[PDB]
Symmetry: D2
Subunit: 326 residues, 4 copies
């Protein structure tokens, strides 16, 4: 049984990803932590509330950082999902928002880790679907508790972050979440004491595991109440971009909870550039480094670069979202 | 007007003189000491603060903070001017106070103090930072709103010993130690929205400009001679401690002795000691090769040019401190009766 | 179309194969070889070119160029894959051609050749750069206008073995050797206004994707030799001992792209530049994958560079095969 | 000692006063003027030098140099303090000298001059740089060895108006214009091995500390002769824009080159230019506390004399000498 903390900036693919986690057996989302990114934290809170209304779930969700770990944001809000990142769909506003605790998301990660009881029946995982600010902030406050995540075998942290080929979608080199907070990425990747290397679910690997617009049409039944919500959520994205639809965060959640969906990967040293002009936020990957090269430069195999996900397993998981009975 | 201070510190020789100055001034109360990495490691820092509070018998609580920069490995080296422990290698008796202290991270303690703070016309809270800004930045990103509880519209909420005014760097060619230790933290502090008063930047050059003479020092610690020659004759426990604390620094460098952190504490509690300053936009360079940690100052920026760049006057660069008031405050340390 | 090539080079093992390729292809004539620092120092490079031209008894002139980057000390290290002289440590007889060469800096020679050139659609001049771009940048800064004499509206004037398309850096984590050697020079080349055709970027990954097999190599070198095969066996002997299923010969791929444009099976035309200021990414190749006409105009960007993504391996092997079968 | 100067310039208002100072001093001869981009474009610059030489009837040759930085697009803006042409928008008659000038790029002219230079104890050669260092850097990478012909063991071969001593940047927060214009070029000049004497750095703050008064200026232009009339016209926009003191930085640099006794204070140490900072690109980095052992450990040496005080009295007298010149 997996217990997940999902850290998110609450866009359309974040919603599909959360839906995937909540409709999979032997998985329980125990907290949702909101971070700035594609929409502002206040709007994010509203989005999560609307998504949890749909499920009637009593999962607690928390306000996190409104900007980067260090300095003004150097990225722009995309707007691909619409002005609220959620379809501008007219969902009824949620009464869940005001009920939520005041605790900063970072302090909540720590509280959950503190209260966590790892055994072989119950494993805890953090999946990060937005800029890493909340996670970095928690890490520098109490680094030790992060060893409670994962197993020697099961990854404690999976992140939707960076590139494997520096096809940047934010600047020329850097992926959005990474570019949003490069400092936070360094803190996550440099951290000592993960039980398993960070799993890097990067842009290119999600591009190569998309859904077809044809598949989408069938998903949304071109109706039970889940398909209706997905149609409304994706309506702006659909008008703006529609042969394939890339749903990155959902790929990340799939990697976390079905590790067999990883068909190919490369375990090596990875870090984030902080200081370049065109390359701030770039993912730097030691492709050729030997154990002897790394020792010399104080590197180590800290990151598993995911290079191929099983598309078939992904589609089935999406299919499972719309067939879910509580 | 009573001041309640939080002092964030990396626990070197000049940090000790600064805390001594805060603790011996009337209408001032140090309510918490938060320890940060810098010239000594946090563990050693804790031991230093404990030895300093033994001297006073003070029950001020102190807290372990960050062991390294906000982001990445330290890019500075430990100076060693005050000795291997940054505190004289003097054989002070180890303190029993250390083990008694609460486990709380220093950052969470700043937030707790701010949360419990009850500012009024008669009570003002101030944060004086005497080391790398890591703890402060960390507290700031967790709960930025609480920081408006510091200061008044008139009295500065934050005074930092940090940076340069002329980029005479003492860590690399351009950057001062504390700034260079954690440039990212400095950006967080200076870019923060909602300080009641601009950050007061007590920089390297203004502290160099307000030093003590070795001759003054000799009198501070009751060395005399004639007769015959230089020896301490009837030292109080404050002078004895100061003599032991500075003994390595003295052997390494000894006409003037610069005590930067003490100057910053003076600025915080006696604002009339600021003879000259320049209010403008200041930030810290994060990305240069030779200039990482540099203090960048908008010397010629107008209201118009700052508006167009998303700048504002966020920092008061202190350029002259009253040396006479500084010496008197040091004098007041050795004359203190509880 | 008769091609006249200027080959700028740091005179390593793959540089030699590349030059051999140019010199054994019909309707191609190498008219100058300009030497640049890189995997070997300029003096050693001069010696290498001399020994290669001895083999052919070619009277092609060759020139000393920059001994270091456009700006600052080198931030790369000499690889040593081809041996201590970058040329097999093979005991080739030293060349008498070296002392005969003109004193002219390589940069000023590029300018002289461009000045004397009569370009038409029958006779095209092409610069192929196989090393750090120092000499080219330096020439470009001094007389940028003359560089329009290279190429056609159809045929590329400049082809460079440079950069990555995927930031699999072989010098630091992100940057390829030639690019990391001189990132400033790379910006000068890619930012230059007035190329008739975009710069062709023969990057690391595309050359990795078009290698030779060690088996192919054994046949190339006949495994009763001829003089070309003997020289290739000796040139690659250290590389072979150090690394030997596939052998990557990047500079040869670049020369192939310059003289047989039909070997480019796939490419992407967009805006490309080189990072100057990153800590881990100095020398990185920055490629505008998603740039549109609207986004590029706002950013002062334009489609300046053709990123080569697949070369025809079959055409490549045939061209290497043609080296060892050459009769003057 | 007879001095032979090459003056590298971006042709603004203080560049003109500076060149006028060089041309009106005894035992000085300007033998070439090399034009570089900066406050005005090279084409405009050429026009300006031509108008200045018309005034003197001088047959000094001048050359077109770099239109932009050594590497990448300019990251600075044209100031416009001296007006739209950097020269007063004054209506000076256009010069017939421009079309006569050789086509040689300025960089290759520096090399030709150095190649033909004949140093002796009677004749010393100096390069004074009054703009972005692009031309000088470009000449240095092409043929570094020739640059040892400049100077003496005692007399500086290169004097530059460049950088800051206190990082009071007038282009960004940290950097001075010329330095910010071309940081890469500054590294090339400062890192060069083989100068006979350290580079003399005539920086922004020391020139601010040796200005002229507007009152002095009034007396200078006779508030009249052909020299004064020209100076009044050249400074007319600057005067309307800014007018107690008027800073004339390039003139201070020329003064330091030709009257070394005007340097009242300086500090010899290791200096370089930041290439990679966001806010500090173009900053002057100075090793204030470096020692002989500390510098050796880090591959540094004393490559640069940071000028910290110039004799204002000597400066004013030299300006005074401009308007009293008889050929
Ligand atoms: Ca997201
Ligand atoms: Ca301190
Ligand atoms: Ca090569
Ligand atoms: Ca000028």
């Amino acid at each position: 049984h997996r217990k997940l903390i999902i850290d998110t900036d609450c866009g359309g693919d974040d919603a599909i990803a959360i839906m995937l986690a909540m409709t999979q057996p032997d998985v329980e989302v125990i907290a949702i932590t909101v971070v700035w990114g594609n929409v502002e934290v206040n709007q994010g809170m509203e989005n999560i509330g609307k998504l949890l209304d749909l499920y009637d779930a009593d999962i607690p969700f928390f306000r996190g950082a409104e900007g980067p770990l260090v300095g003004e944001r150097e990225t722009v809000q995309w707007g691909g999902f619409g002005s609220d990142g959620f379809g501008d769909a007219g969902f009824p506003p949620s009464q869940r928002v005001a009920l939520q605790p005041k605790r900063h998301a970072a302090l909540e990660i720590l509280k959950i880790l503190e209260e966590a009881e790892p055994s072989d029946d119950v494993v805890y995982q953090l999946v990060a679907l937005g800029p890493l600010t909340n996670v970095a902030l928690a890490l520098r406050l109490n680094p030790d508790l992060f060893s409670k995540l994962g197993t020697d075998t099961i990854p404690g942290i999976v992140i939707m972050n960076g590139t494997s080929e520096s096809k940047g979608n934010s600047n020329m080199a850097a992926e959005f979440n990474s570019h949003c907070d490069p400092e936070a990425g360094v803190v996550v990747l440099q951290h000592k004491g993960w039980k398993c290397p960070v799993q890097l679910v990067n842009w290119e690997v999600t591009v190569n595991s998309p859904m077809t617009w044809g598949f989408y049409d069938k998903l949304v039944n071109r109706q039970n109440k889940w398909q209706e919500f997905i149609e409304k959520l994706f309506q702006r994205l659909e008008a703006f971009t529609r042969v394939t639809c890339v749903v990155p965060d959902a790929v990340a959640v799939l990697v976390a909870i079905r590790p067999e969906s990883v068909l190919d990967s490369f375990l090596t040293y990875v870090t984030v550039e902080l200081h370049g002009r065109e390359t701030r936020g770039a993912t730097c990957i030691d492709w050729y480094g030997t154990e002897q090269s790394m020792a010399k430069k104080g590197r180590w195999r800290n990151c598993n670069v995911i290079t191929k996900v099983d598309n078939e397993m992904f589609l089935k998981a999406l299919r499972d979202i719309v067939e879910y009975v509580a």
